[PDB]
Design an enzyme around this catalytic site. Sequence first.
Site, PDB file in Angstrom:
ATOM      1  N   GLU A  35       0.352  -1.579   0.260  1.00 25.17           N
ATOM      2  CA  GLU A  35      -0.157   0.149   0.181  1.00 25.17           C
ATOM      3  C   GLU A  35       0.940   1.537   0.020  1.00 25.17           C
ATOM      4  OE1 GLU A  35      -2.831  -0.348  -0.868  1.00 25.17           O
ATOM      5  OE2 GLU A  35      -3.581  -1.472  -0.547  1.00 25.17           O
ATOM      6  N   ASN A  46      -7.953   8.823  -5.941  1.00 24.19           N
ATOM      7  CA  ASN A  46      -8.828   7.924  -6.723  1.00 24.19           C
ATOM      8  C   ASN A  46      -9.479   8.227  -7.502  1.00 24.19           C
ATOM      9  OD1 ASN A  46      -7.888   5.474  -4.792  1.00 24.19           O
ATOM     10  ND2 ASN A  46      -8.758   6.733  -3.246  1.00 24.19           N
ATOM     11  N   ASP A  48     -12.554   8.742  -8.132  1.00 23.53           N
ATOM     12  CA  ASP A  48     -13.605   9.105  -7.856  1.00 23.53           C
ATOM     13  C   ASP A  48     -13.511  10.202  -7.263  1.00 23.53           C
ATOM     14  OD1 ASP A  48     -13.317   8.539  -5.726  1.00 23.53           O
ATOM     15  OD2 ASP A  48     -14.395   6.738  -4.482  1.00 23.53           O
ATOM     16  N   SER A  50     -11.770  10.722  -3.722  1.00 25.62           N
ATOM     17  CA  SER A  50     -11.876   9.442  -2.325  1.00 25.62           C
ATOM     18  C   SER A  50     -10.077   9.711  -2.430  1.00 25.62           C
ATOM     19  CB  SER A  50     -12.163   9.194  -2.209  1.00 25.62           C
ATOM     20  OG  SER A  50     -12.138   7.696  -2.787  1.00 25.62           O
ATOM     21  N   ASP A  52      -6.815   7.815  -0.869  1.00 28.54           N
ATOM     22  CA  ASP A  52      -6.278   7.332   0.720  1.00 28.54           C
ATOM     23  C   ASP A  52      -5.039   7.706   1.041  1.00 28.54           C
ATOM     24  OD1 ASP A  52      -7.784   5.506  -1.272  1.00 28.54           O
ATOM     25  OD2 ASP A  52      -6.009   4.103  -1.827  1.00 28.54           O
ATOM     26  N   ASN A  59      -8.902   4.148   3.288  1.00 30.44           N
ATOM     27  CA  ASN A  59      -9.761   5.816   2.087  1.00 30.44           C
ATOM     28  C   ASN A  59     -10.831   6.863   2.826  1.00 30.44           C
ATOM     29  OD1 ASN A  59     -10.810   5.769  -0.715  1.00 30.44           O
ATOM     30  ND2 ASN A  59     -12.195   6.099  -0.362  1.00 30.44           N
TER      31      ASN A  59
END
Length: 129
Positions: A35, A46, A48, A50, A52, A59
């Site tokens: 990650e 992301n 969309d 959002s 992380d 998220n």
Amino acid sequence: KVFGRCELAAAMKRHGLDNYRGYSLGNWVCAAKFESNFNTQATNRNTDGSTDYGILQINSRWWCNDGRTPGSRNLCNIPCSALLSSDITASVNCAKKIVSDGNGMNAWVAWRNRCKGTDVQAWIRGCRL
Ligand SMILES: [Cl-]
Ligand SMILES: [Cl-]
Ligand SMILES: [Cl-]
Ligand SMILES: [Cl-]
Ligand SMILES: [Cl-]
Ligand SMILES: [Cl-]
Ligand SMILES: [Cl-]
Ligand code: NA
């Protein structure tokens, strides 16, 4: 902060992640490697909108507030900035809520794709724990 492998294993064990929800420490270390590369300050946007955050790339769609993810929730009741600290307490406490949500560590797509089913004990091999 960029952790070493065994340094992160030890910190995760100190904060009670080892065997949390039945996931051995090597699973957690493997997830963090893919990650964030063990970097607490990792961020990734992301498609969309959002974001992380942190060593386990938690998220903003569900888990933390960053003020820039419309319609999102803040189920860990933290600013997403807390997930970027050198102290992993906020990331671990939030990860314990995520892995309890019903799909276990599948919540972390990198864990499903790169850790699940592999020899994850290699990630803690040699570490004084
Ligand atoms: Cl490594
Ligand atoms: Cl393990
Ligand atoms: Cl928001
Ligand atoms: Cl909420
Ligand atoms: Cl906040
Ligand atoms: Cl820590
Ligand atoms: Cl599970
Ligand atoms: Na949010």
